[PDB]
Amino acid sequence: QVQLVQSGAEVRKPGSSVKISCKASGGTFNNYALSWVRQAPGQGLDWMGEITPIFGTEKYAQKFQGRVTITADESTNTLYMDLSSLRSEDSAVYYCARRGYIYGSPFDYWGQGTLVTVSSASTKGPSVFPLAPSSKSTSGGTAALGCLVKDYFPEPVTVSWNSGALTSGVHTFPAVLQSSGLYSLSSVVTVPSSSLGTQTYICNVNHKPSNTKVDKRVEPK
Amino acid sequence: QVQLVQSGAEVRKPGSSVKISCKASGGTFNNYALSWVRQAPGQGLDWMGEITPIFGTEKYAQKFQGRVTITADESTNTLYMDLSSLRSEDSAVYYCARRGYIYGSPFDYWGQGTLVTVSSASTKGPSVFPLAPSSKSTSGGTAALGCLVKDYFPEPVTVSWNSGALTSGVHTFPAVLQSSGLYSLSSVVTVPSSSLGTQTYICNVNHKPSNTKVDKRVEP
Amino acid sequence: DVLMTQSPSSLSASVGDRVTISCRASQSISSFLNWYQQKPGKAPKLLISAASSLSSGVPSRFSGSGSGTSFTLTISSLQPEDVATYYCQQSYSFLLTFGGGTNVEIKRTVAAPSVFIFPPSDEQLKSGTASVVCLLNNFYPREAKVQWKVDNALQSGNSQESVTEQDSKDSTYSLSSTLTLSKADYEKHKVYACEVTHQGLSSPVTKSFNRGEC
Amino acid sequence: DVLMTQSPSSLSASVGDRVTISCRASQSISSFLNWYQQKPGKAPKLLISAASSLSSGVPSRFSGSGSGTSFTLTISSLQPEDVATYYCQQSYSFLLTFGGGTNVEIKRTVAAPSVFIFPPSDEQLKSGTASVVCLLNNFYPREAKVQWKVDNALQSGNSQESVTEQDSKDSTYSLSSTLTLSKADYEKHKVYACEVTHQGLSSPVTKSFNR
């Protein structure tokens, strides 16, 4: 209500179903209309359907009729979307969106989104390599330090630095799909070279699908 | 030998109109009365109306007065029906039927029928999958082979075997409407197991609403 | 309008039986009464016009009688290919009307079904879905039950069935039942079983396969 | 169904410029037109509802106008934090529909990239692949040419690039280019160089190491 909090990233095989939750954290779904909206890679917002619990009504976009069920559970104060017979094309970010039950109302509250990947490819955890600058590179007063997160499936990986402490001048690049069918990304921080003397620089990599949690300290070579 | 050949099955949105044609081959509509008759699923024949071009007359059943219009183009030997303001209740097979101009005549020629589906859903062609036994199932002496014609809209699909050379022992089942709102159908045939070794078995599937034509060899 | 009423609405008879169906008009229609035969998914076929005149090609086991308000169609010796719905229709009044139909069904000796089970095709599994099919072939009577079991767990809500019209040669039925799972759920279990209940089987017959060919 | 069409598909302007985005409906939607802001991998945020009603907390530099089939969103004073995709959406018909989006970018003074090169880690080389990385930091504009040379042999079809979202504060981009080689191929060569061409640099900048 104050905050729509969705379930974490999901990976499914084609033909399977996915159930995504949306918890009205510190509020309710009473006398609201609850929609699901998706955003496929590099595409726009696509409205899937809506329920208005108070009226016992539900409706879907024609192209999702027979594929999607939206259910609200008062007990858990949770809205669910179940998408069945998944295909590659259903790989997207799914958002819950709340609006007042009244005709014409706008979506004033959105969930953070849930990434769904639909693929028959096997889950595989990443190999994490340091991106270590030469001493010559750092001699100019700036140290570019990074971690290469290689050969994983599926998205996402999360990368932090110093377990949350370093955010300014962190660039975590969008993942690239390689010709192998595996993703890679890099995350780099650029810091004054002298800071290598006064603190550690540790990249924290989490790949939840493979239960991978890796920390790597990065130093110049 | 006159044959009345109707236009294909189609989906139409609620509130739209449908125009169906009926073409006389080996004959004409020039000295005949021309009726349309419909059959809603699992129901009886329901007479809609008739025109007699030779006498310039027309008549319509009270339950279709206004909504159905029947016309003829003798120059192309073609009869039409137009039904407007379609509702789900109008989903049905529509038949043209020809009879003599003379008072009291019976319907001695009928078209093959046209299935109109009133729905907001899109046309979708099927996927065709083989139904074949576990190899040990053939060790018995009778082999059942089939094709599963999955996820199409609207009805209907046609299934032949070996381009219509194989008819004995064929069972093409009624379509079932899945929870997805798409249809699925199976066609099966039983053959001597040994015939698996000496010829091909191919199912010929046609879904005309989507122009989907698939031939699928069936192999255990 | 002239209202046409047929009786009975359905009947069951043995091969070689004399079958009579009735058609009554709400007003006198003289001799202008026609009979059509219709098989499922086929156009109606004219059998008799002017109450009693057989169309060319119609076998003489078919006859029609009556005039005014009361008509009958008779099959002197019911044959397997006579299974159909029969419709009367008046051509006396300008607004033509059909009777509601009479379904003619055959009764015959009980025949237990042959049973075939089909694993999903590799082609369908490659797409992500597993349709498992059970065929009950050439049985009588029509009433039959299929239950699906996956590693002995009774399945509910994930199957659908269809039944053929009564066969024009042998008066039997066939039934297909399709169990639909995701490939991911299909790969979690080993034994796929179709349990068949029918009058011709003193105890249900179960056919199975083992996924991966166990 | 109502089809919502946005114009232009993208725009770039300077901080403080007034910019407008158009939204047209295929049929009259009365007042029932909403505008959202979305940053990449973030939830959309409601800006404007009922054509012209500003959501609480939204800066006054956002406004909306129109009715029927023609609507506009105006930003009177474009700020670096306004870089986003903006979507219109009709709430008139039974089945809701969005416009296709307008991508808003900031124009600022040219900034050349700071360039860094990373050899493959000894850790990676053990497992038989060599990833060489070139980093371009904090540059504007977006367009940049990154070429890989191995012993002066220009490399083809064995590199991939990734780019950051335009920075919400400084309006710059950063870019990574990754060269992938077998360990066998990497060990056969000495000079690894990434050559960068960009509008901020008088001559191409090359960063290199000897294996």
Domains of chain D with CATH codes = 4-107 (2.60.40.10), 114-210 (2.60.40.10)
First and final CA of chain A: distance in angstroms?
51
Contact call for D162 and A44, based on CB within 8 A: no
User: Could you give the strand order of the β-sheet that contains C205-210, starting from the edge strand earlier in sequence?
Assistant: C153-154, C144-150, C191-198, C205-210
Q: Measure the CA angle with vertex D197, ends D193 and D199; round to 5°.
A: 155
Does residue A151 contact residue A182 with C-beta atoms inside 8 Å? Answer: yes
| B46: chain C residues, CB-CB within 8 Å | 98
Name the domain count of chain A: 2
What residues form DSSP beta bridges with D114? D137
- Clarify whether residues A40 and A88 are in a common domain: yes
- Clarify whether residues A103 and A133 are in a common domain: no
Distance CA A148, CA B103 (A): 90
Contact call for C128 and A15, based on CB within 8 A: yes
3-state secondary structure of A194: helix
Provide CB contacts within 8 A for D126, sequence distance 6+. Answer: none
Provide CB contacts within 8 A for D91, sequence distance 6+. Answer: A99, A103, A104, A105, A106, D29, D32, D33, D34
CA closest to B182 among chain A residues: A66
Mark which of A118, A137, A154 sits at the end of a domain.
A118
Distance CA A130, CA A143 (A): 13
- Clarify whether residues A114 and A7 are in a common domain: yes
Q: A17, A60, A62, A86: best mutation site toward chain B, by most B Cβ within 10 Å?
A: A62
| C23: chain B residues, CB-CB within 8 Å | none
Q: What is the DSSP letter of A209?
A: G
- Clarify whether residues B103 and B139 are in a common domain: no
- Clarify whether residues A7 and A56 are in a common domain: yes
Q: Is B139 exposed, middle or buried (0-12, 13-18, 19+ CB in 10 A)?
A: exposed
Binding partners of D (≥3 Cβ pairs within 8 A): A
Does residue A143 contact residue A135 with C-beta atoms inside 8 Å? Answer: no
Chains C and D touch (3+ CB pairs under 8 A): no
SS (H, E, C) chain B: CCEEEECCCEEECCCCCEEEEEEEECCCCCCEEEEEEEECCCCCCEEEEEEEHHHCEEEECCCCCCCEEEEEEHHHCEEEEEECCCCHHHCEEEEEEEEECCCCCCCCEECCCEEEEECCCCCECCEEEEECCCHHHHCCCEEEEEEEEEEEECCCCEEEEHHHCECCCEEECCCEECCCCCEEEEEEEEEEHHHHHCCCCEEEEEEHHHCEEEEEECCC
- Clarify whether residues B18 and B75 are in a common domain: yes
Q: A65, A69, A83, A90: best mutation site toward chain B, by most B Cβ within 10 Å?
A: A65
| D135: chain A residues, CB-CB within 8 Å | 131, 144, 146, 171, 186, 188
CA closest to B119 among chain A residues: A62
3-state secondary structure of C15: coil
Mark which of B69, B87, B118 sits at the end of a domain.
B118
**CATH number of the domain bearing residue B165:** 2.60.40.10
Q: What is the DSSP letter of A13?
A: -
Residue type, D148: W
Distance CA C61, CA C42 (A): 22
Structure resolution, Å: 1.6
Q: Which of D50, D161, D209 sits opposite A134 (nearest CB)?
A: D209
What kind of experiment solved this structure? X-ray
- Clarify whether residues B108 and B153 are in a common domain: no
Contact call for D160 and A176, based on CB within 8 A: yes
The DSSP string of chain D is ---EEEE-SEEEEETT--EEEEEEESS--TT-EEEEEE-TTS--EEEEETTTEEPTTS-TTEEEEEETTEEEEEESS--GGG-EEEEEEE-SSSS-EE---EEEEEE---BPPEEEEEPPPHHHHTTTEEEEEEEEEEEBSS--EEEEEETTEE--SSEEEEEPPPPTTT--EEEEEEEEEEHHHHHT--EEEEEEE-TT-SS-EEEEEE-
C-alpha distances (whole Å) from D34 to each of A79, B181, D5, D24, D71 are 23, 32, 13, 12, 10
- Clarify whether residues A185 and A146 are in a common domain: yes
Phi/psi for A181 (5° steps) reads: 90, 10
3-state secondary structure of C145: strand
Phi/psi for C69 (5° steps) reads: -120, -15
D53-54 vs D4-7, strand pairing mode: unpaired
Q: D162, D165, D179, D194: best mutation site toward chain A, by most A Cβ within 10 Å?
A: D162
Report residue B147 as tokens: 């094709």
State the DSSP H helix or E strand holding residue A156, giving kind and residue range, or none if neither.
Answer: none
Q: How many residues does chain A have?
A: 221
Buried b (16+ CB within 10 A) or exposed e, C30-54: ebbbbbbbbeeeebbbbbbbbbbeb
Provide CB contacts within 8 A for D160, sequence distance 6+. Answer: A176, A178, D177, D178, D180
Q: Measure the CA angle with vertex A176, ends A174 and A180; round to 5°.
A: 160
B122 to chain A, closest Cα gap in Å? 8
Residue type, D63: S
Residue type, B104: G
Buried b (16+ CB within 10 A) or exposed e, A52-71: bbeeeebbbbeebebbbbbe
- Clarify whether residues A24 and A106 are in a common domain: yes
| B113: chain C residues, CB-CB within 8 Å | 43
Contact call for B122 and A65, based on CB within 8 A: no
Binding partners of A (≥3 Cβ pairs within 8 A): B, C, D
- Clarify whether residues A11 and A105 are in a common domain: yes
Distance CA D88, CA A148 (A): 38
Distance CA D28, CA D6 (A): 15
C-alpha distances (whole Å) from B1 to each of B4, B95, B132, C46, D170 are 10, 19, 41, 16, 84
Phi/psi for C54 (5° steps) reads: -70, 135
Residue type, D186: Y
Could you tell me the residue range of the domain that residue B136 belongs to?
127-217
Does residue B17 contact residue B69 with C-beta atoms inside 8 Å? Answer: no
A196 to chain C, closest Cα gap in Å? 49
Strands, E, within chain A: which ranges?
3-6, 10-12, 18-25, 32-39, 45-52, 57-60, 68-73, 78-83, 92-100, 109-110, 114-118, 127-131, 142-152, 158-161, 170-172, 176-177, 183-192, 202-207, 212-217
Task: List the one residue out of A97, A110, A113 whose CA is nearest residue A39.
Answer: A113
What does the longest C-alpha to C-alpha distance in chain C come to?
72
Sign, CA dihedral D38-D39-D41-D47, equals negative
Q: Is A152 exposed, middle or buried (0-12, 13-18, 19+ CB in 10 A)?
A: buried
C106 to chain A, closest Cα gap in Å? 39
Does residue D108 contact residue D87 with C-beta atoms inside 8 Å? Answer: no
Does residue A95 contact residue A34 with C-beta atoms inside 8 Å? Answer: no
| A67: chain B residues, CB-CB within 8 Å | 180
Provide CB contacts within 8 A for D42, sequence distance 6+. Answer: A112, A113
Report residue D50 as tokens: 């009922």
Does residue B171 contact residue C114 with C-beta atoms inside 8 Å? Answer: no
Buried b (16+ CB within 10 A) or exposed e, B65-96: eebbbbebeeeebbbbbebeebeeebbbbbbb
- Clarify whether residues B164 and B87 are in a common domain: no
Phi/psi for B128 (5° steps) reads: -120, 120
Chains B and A touch (3+ CB pairs under 8 A): yes
Mark which of B50, B83, B118 sits at the end of a domain.
B118
Total beta-carbon pairs less than 8 A apart between chain A and chain C: 26
- Clarify whether residues A24 and A102 are in a common domain: yes
3-state secondary structure of A171: strand
